[PDB]
């Protein structure tokens, strides 16, 4: 007796909060944090969708979503470590050389 609309609304709220955190923060670590929030919100939305229909498909795509999240966080933190190694700051506005 939990509506599907409420779970989807909660997931959409978490997704837009993650997108806002991804946009308004120049720190690369906070952008990776925002990316984790958005992909976790997408996974939560899929879990809600699979639980409404009574199928394991939601949890299977949750598993695929968090496999992607783990590997993307790995690559993003490796790139963040490399950025901090070669330029000692995580401000991405310095990383803007290609333009036009």
């Amino acid at each position: 007796m939990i509506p599907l609309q409420h779970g989807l609304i909660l997931a959409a709220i978490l997704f837009v909060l993650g997108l806002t955190g991804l946009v308004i923060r120049r720190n690369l670590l906070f952008m990776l944090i925002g990316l984790e929030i958005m992909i976790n919100a997408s996974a939560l939305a899929f879990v809600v969708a699979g639980s409404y229909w009574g199928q394991t498909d939601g949890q299977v795509m949750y598993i695929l979503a968090i496999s992607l999240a783990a590997a993307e966080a790995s690559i993003g933190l490796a790139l963040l470590l490399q950025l901090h190694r070669r330029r000692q700051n995580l401000n991405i506005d310095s990383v803007s050389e290609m333009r036009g």
């Binding site: 598993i63 968090i66 496999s67 783990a70 790995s74 933190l77 490796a78 470590l81």
Partner: protein, 101 residues
Amino acid sequence: STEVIAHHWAFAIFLIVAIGLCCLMLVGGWFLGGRARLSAKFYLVAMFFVIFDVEALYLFAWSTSIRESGWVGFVEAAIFIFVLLAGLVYLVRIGALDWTP
């Protein structure tokens, strides 16, 4: 039901009493008594833990339904574990998992 909701209430009381016990211990400790850059190896090992942990979750999901999946599922999980061990051999043989070079 009755047994299930009783076990749920027991688990809730377990959580509440454990949290309250730790909080009360810290509060009693506070109130009583008078007064007067790391190397990349840590990132590498944590990343390896994350990747092999999600591959472990795949094996967790397989292991609880082995009999219902049959020999086909055994073949598929054998391919999965073979790719796991090939990745592990690749990591070991290139010195990624060696703490000292």
